[model samples]
Target: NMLLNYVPVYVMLPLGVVNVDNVFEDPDGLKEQLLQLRAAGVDGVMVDVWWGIIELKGPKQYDWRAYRSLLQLVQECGLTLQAIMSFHQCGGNVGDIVNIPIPQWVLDIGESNHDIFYTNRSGTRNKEYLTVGVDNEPIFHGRTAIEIYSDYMKSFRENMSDFLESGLIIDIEVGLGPAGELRYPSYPQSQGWEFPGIGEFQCYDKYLKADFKAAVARAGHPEWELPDDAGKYNDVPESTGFFKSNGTYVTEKGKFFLTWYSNKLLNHGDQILDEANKAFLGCKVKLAIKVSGIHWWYKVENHAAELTAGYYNLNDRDGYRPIARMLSRHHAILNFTCLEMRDSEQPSDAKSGPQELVQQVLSGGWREDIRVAGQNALPRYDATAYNQIILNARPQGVNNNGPPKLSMFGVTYLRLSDDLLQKSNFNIFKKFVLKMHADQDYCANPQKYNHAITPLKPSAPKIPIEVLLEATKPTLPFPWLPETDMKVDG
Candidate 1:
């Protein structure tokens, strides 16, 4: 008799081999890769339906031929698709290999009003995404940002209705901010942001400033203003008063600002997702919104990276619960990243906590009764990374006698690249996909599936079982609630 608490998992890869003009960079190669992935048992492929490319020429002038044919290929491959309604620019963010800006026409407008994009406190502008401040402003050729995104999605729905009805398009991940995540463009790379830094806030634009003025006045603090103590894009948590220990982040004034800041982000997500829900209403596909995995400075009083990213998740307070709650109203799935990382892999000085952050975010989603999906923060093809992903995807009962529990709706692999197709890497990837599909017993015996042609080079290095076990062991409670004065038991 079957005894395991099994959850069927969908293994997905991303569509990455595309050109600036939005056509396949290497059609033949991509097709062959898709065929190979299908043979290896990949359930679906996630694609970025870039707004920059689709409506590049002008307003309401969409070019869907490229994505149309691409989706056709995916449908033919028998792999489900997760199309991203990417409203942001592509380059200059973490892990971005290409530079696809918002439509040139949109940039042309920004040349006159620099506030069209998110501005930092230092007056540096990031063109990676349109600012949420302008969400209601009719600065885009008589259309607001939300209208523009909605029109884009509507066009997609009309065009891809065939695939939608056929069950080929299973998901639509809406891009709400930079890097296609639902957060502020806080730690933008163009502004000299580096790893593990406490990124500056993105509410310096005139539109947001005006909103802040009204909000602060309404809060009975007419003299109060936006935070000036937050450090530059490259500063660490301790380097700034707002994010340091006993800083303003935990104070009444700071709490007020943070609430307004994060709530604005939530409003952005709600408006856009509401539009997306309407655009794709009555469709068979599920709608997903990504929450950035800002893990640095997590152990500190203020999770600086997350705060900058508009998460507002302090060490004592739960930040993601609000996001999950908003997502549930629309029945949207939460797509999170950084599942493949462990606490030990990150720098200790930064107080990074990828594992703990994952648990908290996943718990927030679970508490809200929303479906959660995850992805790797960085690219990796090793067994250790795959095992970590599996650990996060199916976190319970794998290492113990208790019944296994799948915590995620699915896990989408980063991208489709040449390195991923290599024999050695692909071999490991095939095994990972197998584990995503089969039960513990089927995957336990490697002898049945390990008889493939040996790699010409040495196999990927393996971590010691003891080390791996130590890393994956259940050290904390699965769905712990954040209490005001509870010290972490680490």
Candidate 2:
């Protein structure tokens, strides 16, 4: 009965074991992995595209070799490729290190301006790097970052025009730093309470402020001085109760001033994200019309100290969640990565459990029409449970309680070892094509032979896999599943 309506399913394969620096460097090794993943019944391959590499040599000269062949191979195998384009990796900006390649041009632009961007406590400019593990409240003007990001997108479209057209799922991480904090300390001007961010932390940058002021004036608050009293508006220190007050009266004024800034920041951040979506959609339409889907995979700040400094952890704030749902309004798939899922403080019963907080977050507030997915840390079990939950929740779509049917996609299960794969009782290593076919035929399809459930909906537009190899596509070689006698016995 469960197999009556064949539902589509897919598997995710991490590109390699190496760190970001060398992850994309091995073309042959990547090809081999892609072949193996295809053979395992995997439907798509998610590769972490580091900003560090793309930005390392500078925008003009990128090392395509790092991922060129692997991408090509995945396409050839008829597999959907979800490129996790990371703006920051390992809690730091790629610009600071030699390992991750960041185009020097972007770095130069980010570094050249101090007042326009946020600076870090270590005196590093926040332009090219991300601030991690700190309670730094660096300033970020929506207009400037949007303009710069838009320009970068334009160039990115130009550089990766072909790849975009290659039928790959483009997933992006917009806010990569710690949640709640104004900005990470990696920025150059991140030092001291006297930084310009004290005045310009949110999007009420010159443009937004002017617009907001105009709106307020139109609404009759013509004399509003933009609310700059720290005690009244400064929610930064008050919300966290961490900062030392210079004076009670002055601190109160700063708190007030910060409150105003927070509202402005939220409003403007939404506006900026709106602009970014427009830019991305515009690019997709003009350059890669074939590319049908875009996802906003929000990476929440998990570090406690970092989370305490204004960023929201599940225990504290719910800032990013709103932004994520807001972004989903633009029709982008909303996905979440629960950074603290494996945390020690998490209850033992829920520790690495299937229906964990990640699942809870996905089912909460998501529209019935909109799809939700999860991407978790290593040790594949959590991801597999998440996938099962997704599949189970698909029929009801978005529900308030109980695990919903949703299939997992874009899983980058690190620490995967042959020993682990061999010891696992479940078919964790099976390919996506076979799993989708089997699940549709046996699990979801009311009619056992129904073909509708074979290929999942909301998938890549093009059918990248071939027919004859379809039965065993998961085990074929590059672009084709390798021939293997291994089969799942139900």
Candidate 3:
């Protein structure tokens, strides 16, 4: 019993979260491996274009020949492409400890004390910061991040003209924060910290402090100062009164301060979109940004907001909703991540604790693929997930009776891998797809597992490649039929 005709399933390319050194190290093997995905029912592939990778040699010098070939191969294989402009790279969503930094030139500026990085509460400066710029459109190191990031994006568009014009590409996910999610790196613990995990830290650099002080004054707390001094998180609590120890505002002053800081993220994203529109001008390829949708603040107790209130509030009138609404209005996708993580779903006493589970599904009953997300079935769509992603979705308050956000706008799964192509693993991989298809069928037909079914125009059945010439040794790369009429521009 199938209600929807088809489901659009895209896998994140073997980058960032997944170990795909072979993709860069071995070319033919990469294409053959992707061939397996095409042979499967996957609709498209989402690849992260690392800022650290292309411009690592320096700015404006890009070697996307391999990436371009990958895009072309996807097209030849009859799959769509979603290019993620991952402007930041610190760690992977899963256990992969990948590190892609901003180009060396940008790092050199911060190393020379150009005031481009953030200083934490312990007076320790963060030079490993690869994500954010100084402030809202601030001219850091003579150019704003939007100015610099867009130049890279434009160069990419100019270089991979085929990918942009491929018509197979549906969207581009722009990375706005560390690990490509939009937020300040409040939890940077590797560098020696007064507190390791509990990120009570705020941006304490000269530029941010001055901005913070000005913001406090604007909200009628002219007497406050940035508590940036060493050991202030423990010793000097008064200087850090913008957010109460309980995570509430200090007489509403913290709201203005925190709101300013949070709005910085949105403002930067809007600018990135503006720049992206300029880069991919007159093209139909959509723009998207993702967020770690879990209420990280709720991970702890009474001190939940204290942990993350400096950046966002889960139960605030001035929180994620306003930002999400704007992004939705602008025709940009707001993808919510960590949905596949099982532990991320919180089970609570009915009607709200903290006072509600991060998501509310129809709890309890004879449910297939069911879990008690507060006594509701939390059936996920993917055949498999790449990480310990949690399904903690929140209501965006969209009253319009349209398709679900993800059903209307697709998402990328990080689960697919090279090994999955083998006969054994291929069947293993197909299990997830069958499960997903059945669930979609059930939902669209009459509802077995819980989810909005996407009715895909019936795709020509995937031409299955059941057998492969198993390789015994390192294989040669697939040859690129380079365009011969290429001109060298001076």
RMSD of 3: 15.4
Candidate 2, residues 234-260, lDDT tens digits: the string is 123332222323432234433333333
Instruction: Give TM-scores for every candidate, taking all chains together and pairing residue i with residue i.
Output: 0.87, 0.53, 0.69
- After TM-score superposition, what is the CA distance of residue 196 in candidate 2 from its true location, in Å? 30
1 versus 2: better TM-score goes to: 1
Q: Number of clashes in model 3?
A: 15
Candidate closer to the true structure by TM-score (higher is better), 2 or 3? 3
Candidate 2 displacement at residue 426 in angstroms = 8.5
User: How do these models rank on lDDT, best leading?
Assistant: 1, 3, 2
Model 3: per-residue Cα lDDT over 70-101, one tens digit each: 67777887777778787765553333356666
Cα misplacement distance, residue 429 of candidate 1 (Å): 1.2
Q: Per-residue lDDT for 362-431 in model 1, tens only? A: 8767766778889888889888777777667666524235444445777888867778889988888777
- The model with the greatest lDDT is 1
Give me the displacement of residue 283 in model 2, in angstroms: 7.7
Q: Against the true structure, whose TM-score is highest?
A: 1
Residue 121 of model 2 has an lDDT of 20
